Design a protein around this nucleic acid. Structure first.
Ligand SMILES: Nc1ncnc2c1ncn2[C@@H]1O[C@H](COP(=O)(O)OP(=O)(O)O)[C@@H](O)[C@H]1O
Ligand SMILES: Nc1ncnc2c1ncn2[C@@H]1O[C@H](COP(=O)(O)OP(=O)(O)O)[C@@H](O)[C@H]1O
Ligand code: ALF
Ligand code: ALF
Ligand SMILES: [Mg+2]
Ligand SMILES: [Mg+2]
Lengths: 448, 448, 448
DNA sequence: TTTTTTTTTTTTT
């Protein structure tokens, strides 16, 4: 008979210390819960202690015994004599933290044993469940265990700890001779004048109108980053297939249009320049592309965690686009769904320390204004995106709106929202034929 | 005693198929390994088969017996008589992939049981390991479990692999289609591109609103399967009488107006088409339909077993529909009744190894959404249905909800869940006059 | 035989505590009387204790024993040995108030039982009284019960009591010679001219668009509170990691540009400023920051109570922001969830007597208007927010919406709700480089 | 466990 491991002496010491000192109750309340006690009468005792403390009543022997007696639970836990014995057996509450740690350890061990027994029972008797069902159930149980055993600190942090961590980060950055561009370098020096590269755990939003090269600019950034860094990056282009964009990926590098790439022409003078550029992409092995239209945030998070654990973190996550992901729970309201999606993306970016660039559509009210320059009040699914994003940029081409204009080729990236950084406008040189965004080497006008 | 789960019959069928058909060995070796067999003599047999295949020796009864006798492993695996019994017990090697998948599933479940036993042992015996150490050990074990089956084909992978696949696809598709079929034909090659044919023992659920032609589409699938196979087809029409179903089938096959057939106002050419369709159906004589209302799953299972025994198996089962079956034991709880019905249908499909398509109904709240394209949550009692079903497809028609829709005559079959293929939308052409679904020959819209 | 409810152990604890500590006698006198004791000897003992305390005699073993011997009640209460037993039975008198509450509850229940017995006796023997007479008698008894058991407030308070409390408050304020910020000082002279400091138990809501510096202004307020008081402050940064918040605080206090700090391009003077700021902050050591996401109000309340207990109260609570908190009980209704969150926050603020500033987001409809200066309706789910809040301040920046605005670097803090003050707009100077808010040192503009 | 009426507040276009 395998009795589950436990420490009843630790339980009695915890209860007696609570009877002697309620001020450490939060120290007991932070570590263990009512169900953490191995013995059900001890669970009832701790529940009644929590009820007395939440009422503001001091926790002693007599009050707890009377509170249990009013509920008919005094005799169920052993009577007044058992509670007096438990109070007597505890000499001091000074080391009650170690006893609570032991109780929490025993509770975690028993929970692990129970989950393992459930997994074994489901394995011996599948009961109609297939391979996928059993694997998903096991992974869900393990995720519950891991999330229960990750919730340890989850509370206030003193200034001294926060100041030490922040100054450690500051000294780490100071010792690094990065020479500017601390984040993942975008490959655009003018962009790095404001953005200083794609900082990790940042929710960068490239929100642009359709047929503005929004996906083109995002993939230009992705390709430039892959040229610069070798950290594994991630792409989720739900809208367009990876087959098309790869040609565009070979269009920026060759600095030409696709045209013959989409068709079946063979022109191997600059086509031969591409045949060999791909090899440069071959040796990198740091881009993971999966269109997978109709994605949920859970699946995206699972894929991201998989790739990060496989190849040591993620260089850059790419999402195309925000208005394509499906959340079954909040499918009723689109704005709530977008809020949940953006929250999940921000949480994943903070978890894996990776910049996330996601594309967003806009509203038609932008073009209805006299000023067709996109601002923070023009985004489709308005509130949630502006609330949750860290960096927000707008692609503005005056040539699209006004064909007779001086900004032909000049793609204005309006930084509309940046918490850590000055908002503004960065001029570029978008090659509309070549589908290649480049830097603006012309006369940079003053932003009024 | 909790005996570990295993499938000895699947192992025997795999070994006999490898003895008879060596060319499917690469099919078998992709799915199972030597250690996947629960029985150690089967592990030795698979190891010797792998050794003979790597050495170029043919894998038959005599060569395997001689090779096992050379290593002294003939007596360890049961002997020449046992090997001959293994060869004899396998009627055909065509379905060896399903047996190998079953053996792989049993190996995965036993590995999960072993890992759970290790976890329980570490819980009962910490052996110096702290909570962090046990947490890391459990996470490492579940990481190995995930690494046992981690996407593989579903995996996006780094730039190199997807790049060499995609540029090869482009350089092949520059002017040449070169379709690879890759699936059992169900009358829709575009559908068979994703579904890869009607997978046996799978629970396929097609869901639509009433008047969306769900029964019409199911009948078209049944007709295509019947014209593309010799195995008999079984239909359950609880919603409609069998004569109306026959009229729908004749109208779909002969491409005549349903109204003219129903009213009898048919010309000589329509009569000739009807006579030809009747001749084809009387040539087949494999269509068997039951229209009894309120049928229990027990009666359906008994009749299906009767038909399979009388005809050496059934190609396809049709049920119309899920919500019309009756369970007297669960008449009080509708959701539990639906769950038990779906479980019984899945068990029957696994037992008789026949695809079963049962129609389903949606909820009204789907019409309350801005997007009326169905999802998994729109099903009535969707919780059990989504888990039990393998291939879930929805029928959507924007032309129904929009009079000025440009997609008139176009129906969207949205695969929402597929365990063995990609999800997504396939467009088809609908003839309401003929009540027929056919391949969409219009421009191929790039789904986002 | 149903015994009337009592707690003899609690009574003995009370008697022994009164023998040991007479200073809590008033605490005993507030809750219980002599007739509240179940046993007549205990009633006599409490009567003798009351007589001794009224006469000024100490309530100990010897004096009480002598008084009971002089009145001849020493033998009736158990004798000197029993009195010494009662004295010995009490280890501590600190929890004597809860024991008195227990005895009070027992007395109330016994009185209820006695009155119910009287009513049943009058029912079985009407004795000429009509149904009206018996109803009047029963209602009179229930009125007597409700009057006797609820004398300790629990209802409408008398005018005179509120008048005395209010005049005590006014005299307290008059005696205080600070003549200034009654509440926690904001660090801004013109703001404190209208707010008189951040008053305790007040709900303050700061509303602005994202990237307007609302969190920056809240951090500046936190810095001012920390520099102007020794009480600890509490910060909830659910939007940003605590490292970024600390970097913002360092940039604001040290007046160094955030770009150089983030990029690490800091000179010797900037490093000296940062080091001095760190020294001052570590001298203070009164900031506690939590950046956990999805926090329920229960966890926030528990942590706030813990910090207040550990540090003798909390000066200020900061929440960033309202819409990032999660309540599982009202996850389906966002508006009800926001209402319950705001209600719980106001309850906590009144409980701990601490100003709580929780940030909020604006709807974009205000940007649809010609005037973009915020109103009360522009907040998200503002219906409960405006009611529950004590102070509401909007942050407006015309320079954001107008490139040629003359108010560059100027922010309008529009007090839109103030229960004890006028509404109106106060101008402040904003340093985007240092991300700091300061008193506006330009010319004063008349508010029309 | 399921859907169904019905009111109410919020946000979106
Ligand atoms: N002669 C016809 N011409 C055009 N449309 C037709 C004709 N006959 C039937 N249809 C359409 O075919 C659809 C089939 O849907 P239906 O069979 O009613 O769904 P269910 O299977 O739930 O009964 C109907 O919506 C109907 O409008
Ligand atoms: N280095 C810098 N130079 C100039 N302005 C900056 C710099 N860094 C940040 N800012 C400004 O500070 C603001 C921060 O606003 P923020 O505190 O995020 O508002 P909220 O907290 O309401 O979202 C941004 O709008 C940005 O324009
Ligand atoms: F009305 Al039907 F299938 F014919 F739902
Ligand atoms: F981006 Al914020 F409060 F910092 F909305
Ligand atoms: Mg039908
Ligand atoms: Mg902020």
């Amino acid at each position: 008979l395998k009795v589950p491991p436990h420490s009843i002496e630790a339980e009695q010491s915890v209860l007696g210390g609570l009877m002697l000192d309620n001020e450490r109750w939060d120290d007991v309340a932070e570590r263990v819960v009512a169900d953490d006690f191995y013995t059900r009468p001890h669970r009832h005792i701790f529940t009644e202690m929590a009820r007395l403390q939440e009422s503001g009543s001091p926790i002693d022997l007599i009050t707890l015994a009377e509170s249990l007696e009013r509920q008919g639970q005094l005799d169920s836990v052993g009577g007044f004599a058992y509670l007096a014995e438990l109070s007597k057996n505890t000499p001091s509450a000074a080391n009650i933290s170690a006893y609570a740690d032991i109780v929490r350890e025993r509770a975690v061990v028993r929970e692990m044993i129970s989950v393992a027994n459930e997994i074994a029972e489901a394995g011996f008797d599948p009961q109609g469940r297939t391979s996928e069902d059993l694997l998903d159930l096991a992974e869900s149980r393990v995720f519950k265990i891991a999330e229960s055993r990750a919730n340890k600190d989850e509370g206030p942090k003193n200034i001294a700890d926060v100041l030490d961590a922040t100054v450690a980060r500051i000294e780490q950055l100071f010792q690094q001779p990065h020479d500017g561009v601390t984040g993942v370098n975008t490959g655009y020096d003018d962009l790095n004048k404001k953005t200083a590269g794609l900082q990790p755990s940042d929710l960068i939003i490239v929100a642009a109108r359709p047929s503005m090269g929004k996906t083109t600019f995002a993939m230009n950034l992705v390709e430039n980053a892959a040229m610069l860094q070798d950290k594994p990056v991630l792409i989720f282009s739900l809208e367009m297939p990876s087959e098309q964009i790869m040609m565009r990926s070979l269009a920026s590098l060759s600095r030409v249009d696709q045209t013959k790439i989409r068709t079946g022409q063979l022109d191997d003078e600059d086509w031969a320049r591409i045949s060999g550029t791909m090899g440069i992409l071959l040796e990198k092995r740091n881009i993971y592309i999966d269109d997978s239209s109709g994605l949920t945030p859970t699946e995206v998070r699972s894929r991201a965690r998989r790739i990060a654990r496989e190849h040591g973190g993620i260089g850059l996550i790419m999402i195309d686009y925000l208005q394509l992901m499906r959340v079954p729970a909040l499918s009723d309201n689109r704005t709530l769904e977008i809020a949940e999606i953006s929250r999940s993306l921000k949480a994943l970016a903070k978890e894996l320390n990776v910049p996330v660039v996601a594309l967003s559509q806009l509203n038609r009210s932008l073009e209805q204004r006299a000023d067709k320059r996109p601002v923070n009040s023009d985004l489709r699914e308005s509130g949630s995106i502006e609330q949750d994003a860290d960096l927000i940029m707008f692609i503005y081409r005056d040539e699209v709106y006004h064909e007779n204009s001086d900004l032909k080729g000049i793609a204005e990236i309006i930084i509309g929202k940046q918490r850590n950084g000055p908002i503004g406008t960065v001029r570029l040189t978008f090659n509309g034929q070549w589908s290649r965004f480049d830097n603006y080497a012309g006369p940079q006008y003053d932003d009024e």
